[PDB]
Structure 1
Amino acid sequence: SEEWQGLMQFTLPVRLCKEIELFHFDIGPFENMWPGIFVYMVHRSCGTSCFELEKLCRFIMSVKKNYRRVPYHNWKHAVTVAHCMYAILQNNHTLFTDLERKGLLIACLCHDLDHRGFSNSYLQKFDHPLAALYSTSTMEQHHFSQTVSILQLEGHNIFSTLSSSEYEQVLEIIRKAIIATDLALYFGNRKQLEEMYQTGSLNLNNQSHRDRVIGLMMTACDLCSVTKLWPVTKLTANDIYAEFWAEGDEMKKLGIQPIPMMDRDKKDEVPQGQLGFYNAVAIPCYTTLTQILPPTEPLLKACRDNLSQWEKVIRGE
């Protein structure tokens, strides 16, 4: 209980007071500060007197305990996703309700809690007890379950000054928000919102339209490494493949063949895999997000910049 004492004390350096507000900030070389960076983003965006520092700090360090030393789905990725949602909300400061803004920063930070570095596919094919438990969106539901568990620990419950509803409300925002980071649901989500933007039936007074927009915002954040500056971006993909290939290897060890994406032998097709992933997933995501919320546009511009870079890699420039 002295981890969360060395967190109450943190002051974000003035030199980062601007850098952080930029959509393309790389938290990468600020390891020590990451839990202080998140304290900063919460305060700036939700208020200094909405979470009682201690309970907030208690929370954050515990969440941090509960992320494993995997190559990609780690503490560095929680913060990075949290950061991006900060940037989204800051640039849209009016659309989102007090209760949402708090939920979403929290939901982002726990969204991959206690990941083991295994896809849902993997968990389900090998009848692992988490697949036994949640047939669909397997990891995502554990993540949430794990959010619930850290909160119910002594003195971690940061929502203890809220109505019955108000408490069951925010968690629900978090539930739906964490679930939405199952990428298999993203495709549906995005196609509904597209038809709803063309048609024009899109209504932000409708709470199930709110859900889909928040949904998409979670994908955008989750995927946000494709929006960083190219060296960060290049590097963070290496970490992605390292997670996948360790899952690929684990499959070989079982006399079973992994897919190419998970096949380190296939290192070479990486750039074309990225280009494929940008055209099929990333770009449409940031494209529709921008349609819905215009200020999010530097997300799409940077995504286009990295797509070019991946093209150049493939073509030899």
Structure 2
Amino acid sequence: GLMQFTLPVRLCKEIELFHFDIGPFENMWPGIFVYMVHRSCGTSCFELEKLCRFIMSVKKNYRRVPYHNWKHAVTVAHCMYAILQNNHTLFTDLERKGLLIACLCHDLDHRGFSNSYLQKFDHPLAALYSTSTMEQHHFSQTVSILQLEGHNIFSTLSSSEYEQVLEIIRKAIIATDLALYFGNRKQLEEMYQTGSLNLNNQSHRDRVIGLMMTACDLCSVTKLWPVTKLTANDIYAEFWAEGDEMKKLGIQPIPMMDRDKKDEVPQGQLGFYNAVAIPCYTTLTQILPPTEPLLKACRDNLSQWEKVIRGEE
């Protein structure tokens, strides 16, 4: 009850900022996540023993892939922590519990391949889940781990509160399917601009939590340039492996995934910032004004990618 997690001074200060990097020491990430749950949620939200056992089983079920790994999970959870802490009064007790857990769990047992590749390979998961293939698997793995003995971090909720939090976690994890993001943001755009966006409307909340999940999932584009630049190597390591596997199925991969077209990377990042990231953090800053540092950092990185293209690095 009286056992607080504390962090060294630099982390204690820097963790409050959107652009925080959790660092290269894996053994500190669980402590970082618990610190964020205790300040974001309370010290009583979860039984520490259950939380610790939950965190370590989640970690165990992330794979050693270049990008969609345990570090990505904690990174995505930290971005959500920063949003939640900068919008204190807007979210319910249950949303704060569910969203940090959703973010830690959002890519559980990812193999480093897109939904597309699973579908062209004819992976069993593509038979079982026709759309948002990996995301329905990620949620399924979340429920599995929650059902391990000693792992029910929600045990103290009512029956109906339990179903609400698992429903928040399900929608949050599905929303990380970037195919669903485009429509979701367009709707939030129209609702915000016609003044119909209503945070007491549960279907409106769901959409806004969906956009937060995309914002947290893409948060590599909101770091200081050297972090953004080095993460892009991990991202493309996975994409190029997938392109290789496409070529093995006798399919020319899109140029993004083709490691023979590395030269096209800076222009592909431009396209991605213009088509995906900038619109994402724009609509998010409109709906949640305190998230503006994410938009500003994203624009700075867009400018760094233009500089790469102009041969200025």
Identify whether the pair has TM-score above 0.5, normalized to the shorter chain: yes
Share of identical aligned residues, percent? 100
Deviation at 1:126, TM superposition (A): 1.8
Deviation at 1:313, TM superposition (A): 0.4
User: For the residues of structure 2 that align with 1:287 and 1:256, how far apart are their CA atoms?
Assistant: 36
1:250 to 232, 242, 245: 245
Give the 3 Å change call, closer, same or farther, for CA 307–61 of structure 1 in structure 2.
same
Q: CA-atom RMSD, angstroms?
A: 1.7
Counterpart check, 1:271 vs 2:270: no
Match in the other structure for 1:3: none
User: For the residues of structure 1 that align with 2:245 and 2:120, how far apart are their CA atoms?
Assistant: 13
Give the 3 Å change call, closer, same or farther, for CA 21–122 of structure 1 in structure 2.
same
Deviation at 1:309, TM superposition (A): 0.3
Counterpart check, 1:194 vs 2:189: yes
Deviation at 1:254, TM superposition (A): 2.6
| Partner deviation per Cα, 1:284-314 (whole Å, 9 max, x = no partner) | 0000000000000000000000000000100
Deviation at 1:29, TM superposition (A): 2.9
Give the 3 Å change call, closer, same or farther, for CA 227–304 of structure 1 in structure 2.
same
In 1, are the aligned partners of 2:41 and 2:93 still within 8 Å (CA)?
Answer: yes
Deviation at 1:24, TM superposition (A): 0.4
Structure 2 counterparts to residues 115-264 of structure 1, below 5 A: 115-264=110-259
| Partner deviation per Cα, 1:186-219 (whole Å, 9 max, x = no partner) | 0000000000011000000000000000000000
User: For the residues of structure 2 that align with 1:19 and 1:9, how far apart are their CA atoms?
Assistant: 18
In 1, are the aligned partners of 2:63 and 2:109 still within 8 Å (CA)?
Answer: yes
User: For the residues of structure 1 that align with 2:293 and 2:25, how far apart are their CA atoms?
Assistant: 23
Ranges in structure 1 where 5+ consecutive residues have no aligned partner = 1-5
| Partner deviation per Cα, 1:55-107 (whole Å, 9 max, x = no partner) | 00000000000000001100000000000000000000000001001100000
In 1, are the aligned partners of 2:121 and 2:249 still within 8 Å (CA)?
Answer: no
In 2, are the aligned partners of 1:190 and 1:288 still within 8 Å (CA)?
Answer: yes
Further displaced range: 232-241 or 27-36: 27-36
Deviation at 1:10, TM superposition (A): 6.0
In 2, are the aligned partners of 1:137 and 1:182 still within 8 Å (CA)?
Answer: yes
In 1, are the aligned partners of 2:284 and 2:291 still within 8 Å (CA)?
Answer: yes
Deviation at 1:162, TM superposition (A): 0.9
| Partner deviation per Cα, 1:164-202 (whole Å, 9 max, x = no partner) | 110000000000000000000000000000000110000
Deviation at 1:253, TM superposition (A): 2.3
User: For the residues of structure 2 that align with 1:205 and 1:11, how far apart are their CA atoms?
Assistant: 35
In 2, are the aligned partners of 1:67 and 1:114 still within 8 Å (CA)?
Answer: yes
User: For the residues of structure 2 that align with 1:173 and 1:9, how far apart are their CA atoms?
Assistant: 27
Deviation at 1:49, TM superposition (A): 1.1
Deviation at 1:11, TM superposition (A): 4.1
User: For the residues of structure 2 that align with 1:251 and 1:312, how far apart are their CA atoms?
Assistant: 32
Further displaced range: 228-237 or 30-39: 30-39
| Partner deviation per Cα, 1:205-253 (whole Å, 9 max, x = no partner) | 0000000000000000000000000000000001000001111111222
The 3-state SS of whatever aligns with 1:162 is coil
| Partner deviation per Cα, 1:23-57 (whole Å, 9 max, x = no partner) | 00011334221011000000011011110000000
In 1, are the aligned partners of 2:6 and 2:12 still within 8 Å (CA)?
Answer: no
User: For the residues of structure 1 that align with 2:310 and 2:95, how far apart are their CA atoms?
Assistant: 44
Give the TM-score of the pair, scaled to structure 2: 0.97
Ranges in structure 2 where 5+ consecutive residues have no aligned partner = none
Give the 3 Å change call, closer, same or farther, for CA 280–94 of structure 1 in structure 2.
same
Give the 3 Å change call, closer, same or farther, for CA 8–149 of structure 1 in structure 2.
farther
Further displaced range: 210-219 or 248-257: 248-257
In 1, are the aligned partners of 2:20 and 2:223 still within 8 Å (CA)?
Answer: yes
Deviation at 1:8, TM superposition (A): 8.7
Structure 2 counterparts to residues 306-317 of structure 1, below 5 A: 306-316=301-311
| Partner deviation per Cα, 1:121-171 (whole Å, 9 max, x = no partner) | 111112110001000000000000000000000010000001111000000
In 2, are the aligned partners of 1:12 and 1:33 still within 8 Å (CA)?
Answer: no
User: For the residues of structure 1 that align with 2:5 and 2:45, how far apart are their CA atoms?
Assistant: 18
